[PDB]
């Protein structure tokens, strides 16, 4: 009842006198370790596996035995563990090794349970739930169906590690509305709904029931949508954003993190926000959302007219530079960033990225294209003609889909390029000077939004709370971090980052009078201190 409770079990960290007092003497080998020592031991155990999937499999077993030791190990090696415990290992574990998620507490919904969603939640037996991560396995970018539960599980664990959401107060959810994965539909071992994905009407009937049931049974929870397909993810936020406490990390988290890093890149370049000429390579709804979040943040931090900031952006879709004179009927999201200042004759000659870069003379390249390595040596050399400090953000993943490697960006600019990446890269050394890209990891924002929304209990999560989290992250990058060319505070300091982000999100909910928790301080120093004490810490407490 001590050893077998993964929440209170300490394993070898039980002193000899504790083992005696708890009648577990002789249930453990005789060595007594501190948590630090146990973490070093577990880290060496992880590294005796070569494959990410087998390292994850080891970490699952640690979590099942000693939950405190699992979270202490992740926090001590966060940069290295992140790719094992979430993207991209988690999706490979869901797709081929879904059994690794079987022992993790989760909630499974489908049409068979229509009208029982509320009863199912009550029966799950949680106390004051703070965070719920829901997916349908459809994927923001391999349809996983029911096996998407592993995405919710991995994401919930990042709230616990990143912001000290208590691990008892977070719920991973799969809404199984079927799967278009043909292998799964024929697989004898697929345990989900063995049918193609429901149409929109039935999809919203079940997701409406989910939202309404959760708001009744888990009224203190933030509902975070994860890894929903583009046919639904934007429409879900339009349907629920005002009615329920909810956000989508893929859309809103991404834009908040990228905007924060990008404004710090502007500060380092010397080329001020109204002097930037920004090629946005990629014109999907998400890419335009990131551009708009950049504009919104620059407007908040600097009070430039947002219209003037919109005119710094040159949007490139699969046809070429998006302009009002190009001759096609533009998708709604592309109209706002369409150039009005380019002639029909010029638009016809602005198709290839190299000729667009030659014409626009950009100072920034934002890679949101999800195509090849489009930022060629020739394109980077042209940007060097327009600024002493090119900003180059190859943000498409996987690393193969990325517009340019940080190493190539630094080599071709002889260390001038200011780079943020979607993925971790090793440092690059040029002439004895070391350069390393700043990783725009989503972990910078969602945990702090979760912890802030958990504490403040806002009626909903308006765009003002995401913009505040974005600004808070930008302002955590110290003069020193900036002097060393970092665009973000260090990932390893995620607890301090989360507490600061949460504090600023709470102060914004307080300014809008949407906060329902009147116990919280209303001044930043006292609130920050209160938020730090509220966080769950992977240390042996009792």
**Annotated catalytic residue: which of 86, 126, 240, 488?**
86
Q: According to CB under 8 A, which residues from 451 to 480 bind its own copies?
A: none
In the chain, residues preceding a discontinuity (C to N beyond 2.5 A) are: 141
- The residue behind tokens 């063995």 is 194
Query: Is 86 a residue of the active site?
Result: yes
**Does residue 139 have a known ligand-binding role?**
yes
Strand order in the sheet with 278-281: 320-321, 313-317, 278-281, 364-367, 391-394, 418-421, 438-439
| Contacted entry of ligand SZG, its own copies, none for residue 254, CB cut-off 5 to 8 Å set by kind | none
Q: Pick from 15, 36, 47, 103: which binds its own copies (CB under 8 A)?
A: 103
Q: Which two tokens stand for residue 458?
A: 């806002």
Nearer to its own copies, 123 or 308 (CB): 123
441 marked as part of a ligand binding site: yes
* Residue 181 known to bind ligand: no
**346 makes contact with ligand SZG (CB under 6 A):** no
Q: Report what 104 binds from its own copies, ligand SZG, none; CB cut-off 5-8 Å by kind.
A: ligand SZG
CA 414 to chain centre: 31
**Of 292, 368, 322, nearest in space to 140 by CA:** 368
Among 22, 43, 49, 61, binds ligand SZG (CB under 6 A): 61
Which residue of 21, 27, 196, 243 would you call a contact of its own copies, by CB under 8 A?
A: 27
Residues in the chain: 542
Q: How far apart are the first and last CA of the chain?
A: 14
- The DSSP 8-state label assigned to residue 363 in this structure reads S
Residue 174 interacting with ligand SZG (CB under 6 A): no
**Which of ligand SZG, its own copies, none interacts with 26 (beta carbon under 5 to 8 A by kind)?**
its own copies
Strand partners, 391: 364, 418
Which residue, 69 or 298, is less far from ligand SZG as judged by CB? 69
Task: HSE, CB side, 13 Å, CA atoms: give it for residue 500.
Answer: 16
Which tokens sit at 532?
């730090």
191 forms part of the interface with its own copies (CB under 8 A): yes
Binding mask 92-111 for ligand SZG (x = CB under 6 A): -------x--xxxx------
- Residue 115 near its own copies by CB under 8 A: no
Phi, psi of 509 (to 5 degrees): -60, -40
Q: Between the CA of residue 479 and those of 264, 391, 491, 504, what are the distances in Å?
A: 11, 19, 17, 20
- Cis check for the bond before 88: say yes or no (omega within 30 of 0): yes
Q: At what angle do helices 524-534 and 446-456 cross, to 10 degrees?
A: 100
Cα 507–509–515 angle (5° rounding)?
115
Report DSSP letters for 378-393, one per residue. Answer: HHHHHHHTT-SS-EEE
SS3 403: coil
**Quick one: 341 exposed, middle or buried, by C-beta within 10 A (0-12, 13-18, 19+)?**
exposed
Q: Which of 155, 159, 410, 444 is catalytic?
A: 155
Given a contact cutoff of 8 angstroms between Cβ atoms, the answer to whether 162 and 156 are in contact is no
For its own copies, the closer of residues 30 and 431 by Cβ is 30
From the list 80-88, 191-199, 200-208, 288-296, the region that binds its own copies by CB under 8 A is 191-199
381 is catalytic: no
Q: Residue 226 annotated as binding?
A: yes
The binding track of 38-67 with respect to its own copies, each residue x by CB under 8 A or -, is: --xx--xx--x-----x--xx-xx--xx--
DSSP reduced 3-state for 369: coil
Q: Does 442 bind ligand SZG (CB under 6 A)?
A: no
Chosen residue from 99, 349, 401, 411 binding its own copies by CB under 8 A: 99
Contacts of residue 541, Cβ cutoff 8 Å, sequence gap at least 6 = none
Selection from ligand SZG, its own copies, none that 474 binds (CB < 5 to 8 A by kind) is none
Q: Taking CB under 6 A as the criterion, which residues in 200-219 touch ligand SZG?
A: none
CB 30, min distance to its own copies, A: 6
Q: Which is nearer to ligand SZG, 61 or 399 (CB)?
A: 61
**Cα-based distances in Å from 276 to 184, 220, 223, 360, 366:** 48, 42, 37, 11, 12
Site string for its own copies, 164-183 (x = CB under 8 A): ------------x-------
**Binding site membership for (S)-malate: which residues?**
139, 397, 441
Q: Which residues bind ligand SZG (CB under 6 A)?
A: 3-4, 9, 11-12, 28-29, 38, 42, 61-62, 65-66, 69, 99, 102-105
In the annotated binding site, the residues are 139, 226-227, 250, 397, 441
As annotated, the active-site residues are 86, 155
In the annotated binding site for a divalent metal cation, the residues are: 226-227, 250
Tell me which residues touch its own copies (CB under 8 A).
11-12, 23-31, 40-41, 44-45, 48, 54, 57-58, 60-61, 64-65, 96-97, 99, 102-103, 105-110, 112-113, 116, 119-120, 123-124, 146, 149, 176, 188-193
């Amino acid at each position: 009842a001590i050893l077998t409770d993964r929440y209170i079990n300490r394993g070898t960290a039980f002193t000899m006198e504790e083992r005696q007092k708890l009648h577990i003497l002789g249930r453990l080998p005789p060595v007594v370790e501190t948590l630090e020592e146990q973490v070093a031991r577990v880290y060496g155990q992880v590294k005796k596996y070569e494959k990410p999937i087998n390292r994850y499999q080891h970490l699952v077993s640690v979590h099942s035995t000693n939950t405190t030791l699992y979270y202490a190990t992740i926090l001590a090696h966060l940069e290295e563990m992140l790719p094992i415990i979430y993207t991209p290992t988690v999706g490979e574990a869901c797709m081929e090794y879904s059994h690794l998620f079987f022992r993790e507490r989760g909630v499974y919904f489908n049409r068979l349970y229509k009208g029982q969603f509320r009863n199912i939640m009550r029966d799950a037996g949680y106390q004051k739930v703070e965070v719920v991560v829901i997916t349908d396995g459809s994927r923001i970018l391999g349809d996983l169906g029911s096996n998407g539960i592993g995405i919710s599980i991995g994401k919930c664990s990042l709230y616990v590690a990143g912001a000290g959401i208590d691990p008892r107060l977070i719920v991973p959810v799969i809404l199984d509305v079927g799967t278009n994965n043909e292998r799964y539909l024929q697989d004898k071992d697929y345990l989900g709904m063995r049918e193609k994905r429901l149409g929109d009407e039935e999809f919203y009937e079940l997701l409406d029931e989910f939202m309404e049931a959760a708001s009744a049974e888990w009224p203190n929870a933030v509902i975070q949508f994860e890894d929903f397909s583009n046919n639904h993810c934007f429409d879900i936020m339009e349907r629920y954003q005002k009615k329920y406490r909810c956000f989508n990390d893929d859309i809103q988290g991404t834009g908040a993190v990228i905007a924060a890093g990008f404004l710090n890149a502007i500060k380092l370049s010397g080329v001020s926000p109204l002097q930037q000429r920004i090629v946005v390579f990629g014109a999907g709804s998400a890419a335009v959302g990131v551009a708009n979040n950049i504009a919104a943040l620059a407007a908040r931090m600097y009070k430039f007219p947002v219209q003037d900031l919109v005119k710094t952006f040159y949007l490139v879709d699969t046809k070429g530079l998006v302009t009002t004179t190009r001759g096609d009927q533009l998708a709604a999201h592309k109209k706002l960033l369409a150039r009005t200042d380019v002639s029909a004759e010029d638009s016809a000659k602005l198709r290839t990225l190299e000729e667009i870069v030659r014409f626009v003379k950009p100072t920034t390249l934002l890679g949101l294209g999800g195509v090849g390595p489009a930022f060629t040596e020739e394109i980077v050399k042209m940007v060097m003609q327009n600024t002493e400090r090119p900003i180059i953000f190859p943000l498409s993943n996987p690393t193969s889909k990325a517009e340019v490697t940080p190493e190539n960006a630094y080599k071709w600019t002889n260390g001038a390029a200011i780079v943020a990446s979607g993925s971790p890269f090793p440092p690059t050394t040029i002439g004895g000077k070391t350069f390393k890209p700043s990783q725009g990891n989503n972990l910078y924002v969602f945990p702090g939004v979760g912890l802030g929304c958990a504490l403040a209990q806002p009626t909903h999560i308006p765009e003002e709370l995401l913009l505040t989290a974005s600004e808070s992250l930008n302002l955590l990058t110290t003069e020193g971090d900036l002097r060393e060319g970092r665009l973000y505070p260090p990932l390893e300091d995620i607890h301090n980052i989360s507490a600061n982000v949460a504090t600023d999100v709470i102060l914004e909910a307080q300014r809008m009078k949407i906060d329902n928790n009147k116990k919280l301080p209303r001044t930043r120093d006292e609130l920050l201190a209160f938020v730090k004490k509220a966080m769950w810490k992977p240390v042996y407490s009792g």
